């Protein structure tokens, strides 16, 4: 405790009552002539110490520091995700125990936990004659951690796995679990450091926090105070020079990550560190977003010009795609929008995404791999692809990503509804190259072929089907009418009754030649043809036939309402899209004189049918809950509607304001 070694790499004296041995070291480091006077053995020791200090990042004393360009480099194949290089090193031979200690960590990363446990057990035995306590201590701790991981995974796979998977795969044999339970009983990790020789307890005191409750114990408490300080500095409107309270958090987090990954410690894959990384990354993202919208100061504009020390890079991308679940990124996106906070080093991010796509492609070659590896890798691959929309990709790399996304990518967790969202997010940052549209066409062709057997119902967690892919293709490119998908439209008989409806919903890319077979079997219903046909086109307007087709629906739902209107019950029809026609009255989509008769059945029906005549004191916020673009523009075209809608939005903003009521408001009304 004679010195403080700050995270920026500057040493500052603390007590040092004797002759300063640290400042005298930097004196010799700076002046080459003074280093000559040392003896030969002392000169070699000086060179070895200089190499160690330069590698660890120690720079110089606090006073004679000036501008510091701190750099961070994590040299670990496990961190970067080089799975193939890890497998090559695992399959090769071990020169010494120092290679086995890394091979065990590579095995743990790959998911082969039993082999890693056995290798650690071997290393504990083969590390006696070598007489280095660091390897034995770290092997004991890593074996304990891997045993904890196995016993935790057993509680999940033998628990919810009846519904999580269905096959109920148990990757751990019942005999291996018993062996590890016998061996690991009464381990008492807390009593592992005290049992070692007194020389070890003094030479390697820094390692005491691993085999202890101190593992990320003081770090979490110290991060709490830093988070409070950083949040306070963003509300009082204050500036920070030098090592800010947030730069300390970044440097400290990248210190822990480097120490854990470069030493092959398995404890980097647990909860106490996962929460720490999540909190650190969330705080850093919030602080970076705050800077972009800073308030101009009377003197602070010139008083502090740069004010920036953060920029999201490849390391941030990997730490966000590996430690952030999809849900967490989902809440983060709506609150903080990183679309203006661009990510740099996009070549490395492109390589990382290409590697993820390659892994997801290979792993369906057998699709019977290690279950723990699949469970740990699908989440990371389900977040990097969700996160690539903020990164400008390139040609022939994005092609492979859209390949793997719209191909052998596990359907049990990336069903077509979420797949379309992933694809659209990826295409948002890009401009949809021609090859990408071809790949989407191939996915559409195979998906159409798949449901030809009996049904292949498009079960989707979201309310988005295969038709949305073609809809997006035409919305971004209204020229995709290629012959190949039409080769199954009218070249096949119109008696399947399931392909018929699928080409009905995929109609906008289908021509009349295909129509002669596909639309032939299909007919017109009450509003079912409108709900399916004109919803995607092929009419696009209320044709003269529709002028009487809507007549049936307008009176069917009218009598359905009247049945409970003359008595009063809940037997009103749940098909409330009759309001849509009323809604279509407002946005110049219904011009019928008989619609003045249906007014009075629906509280919002006369609301939309009567753009000005409707009593707007009856106006209710619920009519705007589920809403779209042209109606938004249609308040903007009706001043009286706008007058009452702004009032109700303001009352909501004062009464119940949570997120969306101003969201509707600011985009229009002014």
């Amino acid at each position: 405790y004679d010195y403080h070694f700050e995270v920026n790499g500057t040493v500052v004296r603390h007590k040092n009552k004797g002759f300063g041995y640290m400042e005298r070291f930097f004196e010799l480091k700076e002046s080459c002539d003074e280093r000559s006077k040392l003896s030969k053995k002392q000169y070699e020791r000086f060179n070895a110490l200089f190499n160690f200090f330069e590698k660890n990042g120690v720079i110089c004393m606090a006073k004679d520091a000036g501008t510091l360009n701190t750099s961070i480099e994590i040299n670990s194949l496990a961190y970067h995700g080089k799975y193939d290089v890890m497998k090559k090193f695992i399959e090769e031979q071990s020169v010494s125990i120092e290679d086995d200690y890394k091979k065990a960590f590579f095995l743990a990363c790959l998911g082969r936990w039993e082999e890693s446990y056995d290798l650690y057990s071997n290393i504990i035995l083969n590390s006696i004659d070598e007489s280095n306590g660091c390897v034995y201590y770290l092997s004991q701790i890593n074996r304990y951690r891997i045993y904890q991981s196995i016993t935790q995974a057993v509680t999940q796979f033998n628990g919810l796995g009846l519904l999580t998977f269905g096959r109920h795969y148990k990757p751990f044999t019942d005999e291996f679990l018993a062996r590890i339970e016998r061996e690991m009983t009464n381990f008492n990790i807390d009593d592992l450091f005290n049992g070692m020789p007194f020389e070890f307890q003094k030479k390697y005191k820094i390692l005491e926090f691993l085999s202890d409750n101190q593992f990320l114990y003081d770090d979490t408490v110290k991060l709490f105070e830093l988070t409070n300080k950083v949040r306070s500095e963003m509300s009082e409107g204050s500036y920070s020079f030098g090592m800010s309270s947030d730069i300390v958090v970044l440097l400290r987090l990248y210190d822990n990550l480097r120490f854990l990954y470069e030493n092959c410690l398995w404890s980097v894959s647990f909860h106490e560190f996962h929460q720490y990384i999540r909190n650190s990354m969330s705080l850093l993202i919030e602080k970076a977003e705050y800077e972009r919208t800073r308030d101009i100061d009377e003197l602070g504009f010139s008083f502090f010009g740069k004010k920036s020390g953060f920029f999201m890079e490849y390391y941030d991308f990997v730490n966000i795609s590996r430690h952030f679940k999809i849900d967490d990124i989902k809440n983060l996106e709506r609150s903080c929008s990183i679309d203006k906070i661009r990510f740099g080093e996009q070549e490395k991010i492109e390589e990382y995404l290409v590697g993820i796509a390659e892994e997801i492609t290979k792993q369906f070659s057998a699709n019977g791999m290690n279950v723990v590896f699949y469970t740990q890798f699908i989440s990371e691959a389900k977040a990097a692809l969700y996160f690539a929309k903020y990164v400008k990709l390139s040609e022939e790399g994005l092609g492979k990503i859209v390949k793997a996304l719209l191909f052998y990518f596990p359907e049990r967790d990336l069903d077509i509804g979420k797949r379309y969202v992933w694809l659209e997010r990826l295409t948002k940052c890009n401009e949809l190259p021609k090859s990408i549209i071809s790949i989407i066409d191939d996915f559409l062709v195979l998906q159409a072929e798949k449901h030809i057997d009996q049904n292949y119902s498009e079960v989707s967690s979201n309310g988005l089907y295969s038709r949305d892919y073609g809809a997006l293709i035409k919305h971004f490119e209204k020229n995709f009418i290629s012959k190949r998908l039409s080769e199954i439209t009218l070249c096949l008989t119109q008696d399947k009754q399931k392909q018929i409806d699928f080409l009905f919903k995929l109609l906008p890319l289908l021509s009349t030649n295909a129509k002669s077979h596909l639309l032939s079997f299909k007919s017109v219903e009450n509003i079912n043809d409108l709900m399916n046909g004109i919803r995607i086109g092929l009419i696009d307007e209320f044709t003269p036939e529709h002028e009487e087709l809507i007549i049936e629906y307008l009176e069917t739902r009218k009598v359905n309402y009247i049945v409970e209107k003359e008595k009063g019950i809940q037997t009103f029809s749940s098909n409330d899209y009759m309001s849509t026609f009323g809604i279509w009255y407002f946005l110049e989509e219904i011009n019928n004189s008989k619609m003045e008769e249906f007014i009075g059945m629906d509280d919002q029906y006369d609301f939309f049918v009567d753009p000005e005549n409707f009593d707007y004191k009856k106006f209710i916020p619920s009519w705007l809950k589920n809403y779209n673009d042209k109606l938004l523009g249609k308040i903007a075209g009706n001043k009286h509607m706008k007058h009452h809608v702004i009032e109700v939005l303001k009352e909501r903003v004062k009464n119940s304001n949570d997120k969306r009521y101003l969201e509707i408001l600011m985009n229009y009304f002014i």
Binding site: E236, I247, G309
Partner: protein
């Protein structure tokens, strides 16, 4: 690969009657808070003919890694006062805060002074006659 860029600012705290440099340190944070207060200051219509624009202004500064002058230490140790501060931050600017007040508080660390709490706060004082809270000078980039 991530690289962090960290700038620095040099603060000189000295006396008024002389140029006796009390000490020099770095810069940590600066808070310029200008705002108004509760309705007690201005209640009803009151001064209807003329607008009075109340402006409560505070200028706080925090400093770390401060060492005291040897000559000043010797003079003051061997047996009210108004001081000043000068910044030399980087272009480079010349921030001058005249008539600052050094606040502070004593903290006792369990680990014999873990980080040794070397934080000193200054608050700018505004007198009824004086008005130049801070003077900024611009030099070559």
């Amino acid at each position: 690969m991530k690289t962090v860029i960290q700038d620095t600012a040099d603060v000189y705290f000295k006396r008024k009657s002389d140029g006796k440099l009390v000490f020099t340190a770095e810069a940590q944070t600066a808070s310029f808070s200008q705002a108004i207060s509760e309705e007690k200051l201005r209640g009803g219509i009151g001064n209807k003919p003329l607008y009075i624009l109340k402006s409560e202004k505070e200028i706080n500064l925090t400093v770390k890694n401060a060492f005291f002058d040897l000559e000043w230490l010797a003079m003051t140790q061997g047996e009210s006062e108004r001081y000043e501060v000068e910044y030399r931050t980087i272009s480079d600017i010349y921030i001058q805060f005249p008539n600052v007040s050094p606040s502070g508080e004593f903290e006792m660390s369990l680990e014999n002074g873990n980080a040794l709490a070397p934080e000193i706060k200054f608050e700018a004082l505004a007198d009824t006659d004086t008005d130049e809270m801070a003077v900024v000078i611009e030099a070559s980039r």
